[PDB]
């Protein structure tokens, strides 16, 4: 089973899982420990942000690949804003300084 660019879920903007629903693999927690254990820094940033959960980042990346320029645009993951919006649903002020 393979995937280049497929569908996305509703709540968080992650790709789905499974073969039938045309999904991507779960690059799980222990693999993040493994990439931290090397000196790998940018590759962890792509596997966390450009490949999923940054909407404008990933469409900018796709257009940028088709144009033939390998850059990246970091952005900020939509799932973190989800986390903020359901901590604010409790009585907990939480913001970002500066």
């Amino acid at each position: 089973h393979a995937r280049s660019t497929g569908s996305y879920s509703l709540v968080t903007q992650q790709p789905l899982g499974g073969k039938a629903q045309f999904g991507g693999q779960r690059f799980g927690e222990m693999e993040v420990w493994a990439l931290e254990a090397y000196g790998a820094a940018y590759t962890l940033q792509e596997m966390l942000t450009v490949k999923s959960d940054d909407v404008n980042g990933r469409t900018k990346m796709y257009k940028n690949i088709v144009d033939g320029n390998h850059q990246m645009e970091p952005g900020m993951p939509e799932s973190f804003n989800v986390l903020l919006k359901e901590i604010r649903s409790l009585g907990i002020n939480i913001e970002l300084e500066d």
Partner: protein, 90 residues
């Protein structure tokens, strides 16, 4: 092609300056449109960047010296354009 890396880590400092310096060299070679020093062998830009690192013609000091020189030439050339505009007005 290229298999090894250890000819560069003994030339540049560590395994982490090599990443940033060779990525910067390959980024200005791919898109900025500069011609490579050693000849290509129908390889990508990462491998020819690592080749120019390990032979010893691209380095972080050398990158900043070349960028300062060509940028100073760029602002000097556009000052020459401004003086040409001043010649054309009066």
């Amino acid at each position: 092609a290229r298999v090894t890396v250890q000819d560069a880590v003994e030339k540049i400092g560590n395994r982490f300056d090599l990443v940033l310096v060779a990525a910067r060299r390959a980024r200005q070679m791919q898109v900025g449109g500069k011609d490579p020093l050693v000849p290509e062998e129908n390889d990508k830009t990462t491998v020819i960047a690592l080749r120019e690192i390990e032979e010893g013609l691209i380095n972080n000091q050398i990158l900043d010296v070349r960028e300062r020189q060509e940028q100073q030439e760029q602002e000097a050339a556009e000052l020459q354009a401004v003086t040409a505009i001043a010649e054309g007005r009066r």
